[PDB]
Amino acid sequence: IAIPVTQELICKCVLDPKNSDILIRTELRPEEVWLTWTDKNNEHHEKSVRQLAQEARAGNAHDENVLSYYRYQLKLFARMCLDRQYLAIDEISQQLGVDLIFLCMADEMLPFDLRASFCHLMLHVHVDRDPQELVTPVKFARLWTEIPTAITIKDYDSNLNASRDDKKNKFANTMEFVEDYLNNVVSEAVPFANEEKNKLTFEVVSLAHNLIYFGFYSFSELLRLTRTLLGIID
Amino acid sequence: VVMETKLKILEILQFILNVRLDYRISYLLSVFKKEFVEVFPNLDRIGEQAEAMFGSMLEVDDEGGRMFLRVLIHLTMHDYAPLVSGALQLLFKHFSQRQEAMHTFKQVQLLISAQDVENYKVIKSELDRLRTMVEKSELWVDSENYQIVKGILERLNKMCGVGEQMRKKQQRLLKNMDAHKVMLDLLQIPYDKGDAKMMEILRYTH
């Protein structure tokens, strides 16, 4: 459970501009994501995540250390923003965009651990803002005019779609990626075999659960995802 | 990590089963409305329609429910306590669909009168505004927001109204909108002693 006091102090201290050197900066350039950092001395390194992962797989020490620092920093950012401590998610959202995190997470060449960290940040930064709220599934109150003469599944989600105020959902592509990932993992003969992949699977499952509880999904999509979830379970 | 995701999947399934109940309630109300409008611009037909759904597109799995019980039993056989508790709860709820559906259907309000429509609209608007302000309580706990909240609370207090039958109907309606959750959340708002406006709004909430 988040501790507001110490969280606020760390928010005001680590994000303070004087301490910006320790924080690695990721930027999307014409697109590809590039990481910029500074060594212990006064030299600045600018590279890209793809080559970093390739060299880490090869066995280069510096690449592995930099990648480890980046994932742990991402974990620290995700932990900082827990419980809607807005003073931080404002800065994090400005620094890290939805599209940038989507690009980093969706691509497969990156290590599973980094993808899991990105998923955690995505869930605890952008999904957990407050243009949303928990949606009660069953609503006792119903209007005599709203009740249609004939109701089907599509007609049922039509009213929910109309109620939604977001003409273009900002997380729709995230839902698509979640669906593809779950389809791939269920398609695999052994859904839970690789230890590293388990972290990413748990992360995407948590992201999906929080997305569903906010009313993003539709009844037909809910049923399809339910079938896939039952498949992965057994 | 492998067990927590299973528990989360169980939670997803538990929530997704409620929207099925909502759809069933909507279908029952639609059948009612069709029957009522047709007869007055029958009981056996609507009874047959209501019985048909309960036991097939709404099925959780394509296997007819066997898969759902299979995973529930397998999870129940595991050692994790929360996972087994969730599996047992789902198993029991799976074989009591009709009882829960009828029990929830009995507690349904139609809001046919125009007056009821106006109360619904105004209450929903005020609840949304108050919830939005409460979610950002930390900003204004220690102004325009204070007077806005006070006005909303006073408007709701006047909205309560008078009349035994009107009182009961309005109380049921407010319970349907779940306004008591907003009230309780506002009561638990962080407070600093010595703020007259905060005490005034707290008194209005009480």
Q: Which of B2, B5, B169 to mutate to test the interface with A (most CBs of A within 10 A)?
A: B5
* Three-class SS state of B120: helix
**CB-nearest partner of A206 from B8, B37, B120:** B8
Asked if residue A93 lies in contact with residue A125, where contact means CB atoms within 8 angstroms, the answer is yes
CB < 8 Å to A153, chain B: 23, 57
- A49's CB contacts (< 8 A; 6+ apart) are A26, A33, A34, A35, A104, A110, A114
Nominal resolution in Å? 3.7
Contact B109 A202 (CB under 8 A): no
Q: Find the closest chain B residue to A207 by CA distance.
A: B8
Q: Cα A98 to chain center, whole Å?
A: 8
Residue window 90-109, chain B: list those with CB within 8 Å of chain A: 104, 107-109
Rg (CA), chain B: 23
- B132's CB contacts (< 8 A; 6+ apart) are none
Question: How was this model experimentally determined?
Answer: cryo-EM
Asked if residue B148 lies in contact with residue B163, where contact means CB atoms within 8 angstroms, the answer is no
Listing DSSP states for chain A in one string gives ---HHHHHHHHHHHTSGGGTTTS-EEEEE--EEEEEEE-SSS-EEEEEHHHHHHHHHHT-HHHHHHHHHHHHHHHHHHHHTTT--HHHHHHHHHHS-HHHHHHHHH-SSS-HHHHHHHHHHHIIIIITSSS-----S--SB--TTTS-SS--HHHHHHHHHHH---SS-TTHHHHHHHHHHHHHHHHSSSSS--HHHHHHHHHHHHHHHHHHHTT-S-HHHHHHHHHHHHHHH-
CA-based nearest distance B2→chain A, Å = 6
Which structure tokens are listed for A158? 């039509």
Flag whether residue B49 sits within 8 Å of chain A, measured between CB atoms: no
Helix axes A153-163, B2-39, angle to 10 degrees: 100
